[model samples]
Target: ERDCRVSSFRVKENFDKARFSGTWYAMAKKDPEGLFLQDNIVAEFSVDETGQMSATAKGRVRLLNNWDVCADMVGTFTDTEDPAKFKMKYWGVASFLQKGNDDHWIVDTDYDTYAVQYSCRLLNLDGTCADSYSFVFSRDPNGLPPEAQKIVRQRQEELCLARQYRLIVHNGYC
Candidate 1:
């Protein structure tokens, strides 16, 4: 397996049922710290009628102590050769086509823990390896323990190649 930062609590043999369902707030991030800071990170994933998976990710950053900045993107699973590997696309976005099909991959995941690692090879127009990201879930972000926090950061560093200082939690709760 690649050294990608991915973490999940062992529930149901390897996944956390509670964390897998509902929304997961993005508490922290690896390389692109400022890109998502002060934003309310929310993600939704599920399998559609066709047996294909779908996802909607939203980020609402804090503009001020009372105001928030929000942005959203939606995508659906396009390919999955194995349960552990999947690809997605954001064709709904008007600018997506200019980027040559905004596709990304879930290279690794742990369903029980509701943790997943996403990597995009074409994050930019140049087609270089964009920063990889992982989300460690919990019933609530504040419920995460120190050890769990350490694990999340560890995975971020290992997989995203983040520097020690680059790992940042937007609101101190993630």
Candidate 2:
């Protein structure tokens, strides 16, 4: 049993940005308020020599009633006291898309298999998250192994978002 407070959430003890680089397919997702990526979501992370981590993402976004477009977005992360936590300033390549800074936390990662990302937009008065989003990423687009799935599931539950995720299909929409 665990408390559902965001303050009590555990992140990766020693997150390595370099090892976390490369392409990652979004296996599943829990979205925050307003608009979000629909499917075919893929993220590419890079760590420069300056030890700064930046990322790019491509995904299909359904805007308005009948509009679906591939959204290309970029993000730069600023380090915090916790190695696993960062503030990510992100925006769409096309000026019309979403843009803002979000809390990016690496909840768990095995580097080679899977990674769990969590973000809290607004915090509740009691330390819980009022609005949050999470992504379950896999090195392979097909998804993760049974062993990795087991671990990912446990982490998802720990984030208090186990039942909030939806499988992100990759049908080359992006």
Candidate 3:
């Protein structure tokens, strides 16, 4: 429903280490008509000295608008035998590591030219109901390239159509 076309897009690829330090922004989402609408979204992530992950997401409908902040979530990472096979979590949400799965959500990242993608899913405190929702975050809000953005929209559209999850509303901005 929103038109997400920002000509000035920059990506940061070394997001793995970078994500552990700074914040990120939401750039677009896929709609039924295959349109990626730009939204006013922002998020920040940090891994404390104890290696625990903490995050905050804020969003607005317009540039001059104020952001609505979400409750902060705390998480950590679990490494699999493979380096890329790891899970990131926050409160009850977790994003399982996968090479090709769209369920991965990017939790932490650095805002740079080549951003890394963090994949994650939401979970219940009991670790059940793991498939409720998932997110793919980049290091920078405008980091995604045109082609990559297209793929993100496609994935989001599929999720929306499945009726498996819905975007959480935060004052209608998130």
Candidate 4:
């Protein structure tokens, strides 16, 4: 028997923040420990005029935990030598929301159509992921096209997260 875990993965060769800025829907995703994404998720990305990336996300967390009606999270990204990688500090709009830092990387994107992204939430003592997540995003709110799905599948396969992903449903509401 063999057990494989998500620890490392490849990143987009030349990621462009300009092309990636805009609203995106999470068509599919793999949740890690303490998974927060419940449903009705929408994310907006923007690169400031100074070339720094910023993010804001909103989603309805489950009823099991005590939280807000819609979880609005703000993320500030730190630049890396590679344009594809970023260190993100995120927190909820209100103190009651989720807060933490994570590694954000652009796996691939074509700007006008779709995108694949990866984030490692925590590094365990073993140097393996204590928690992590990956999202298949699309410009369309309803869903992603078949062509984009294929590419995302390939990227997920490389990340070893394909088998663990669940179909992320968007309820047409923020």
How much lDDT does each candidate structure score? 0.45, 0.94, 0.38, 0.81
Off by over 4 Å in 2: none
- Which segments of model 1 are wrong by more than 4 Å? 1-21, 31-38, 61-68, 91-114, 122-139, 160-174
Q: Of models 3 and 4, which has the larger TM-score?
A: 4
What is the clash tally of candidate 3? 32
User: Model 4 Cα displacement at 129 (Å)?
Assistant: 3.4
In terms of lDDT, which candidate is stronger, 1 or 4?
4
Model 3 ranges off by over 4 Å: 1-15, 28-41, 47-70, 92-132, 138-145, 151-174
TM-score of each: 0.56, 0.97, 0.39, 0.87
- Candidate 2 lDDT tens digits, 35-90: 57888999999999999999999999876767788999999999999989999999
Best by TM-score: 2
lDDT for each residue of candidate 1 in 45-83, tens digit (9 for 90 to 100): 766556666667666544355665554656676654444
Which pairs, if any, clash in model 2?
none
Worst 10 residues of 4 by lDDT: 1-10
Q: Candidate 3 residues 46-123, lDDT tens each?
A: 666665445544543221234322233344555433333346543412233111222223322323422233232333
- Model 4: per-residue Cα lDDT over 1-174, one tens digit each: 123244456687889888899998888888878888777778899999999999999887653567536678899899898788899999988897778888898888888788888887776676556677988888998777788878888888877677988877776556
Decreasing TM-score order of the candidates: 2, 4, 1, 3
**How far in Å is the alpha carbon of 159 misplaced in model 2?**
0.4
Query: Model 1 — TM-score against the truth?
Result: 0.56
98 in model 1: Cα distance from truth in Å? 10
For candidate 4, the lDDT comes to 0.81
CA error at residue 108 for candidate 2, angstroms: 0.3
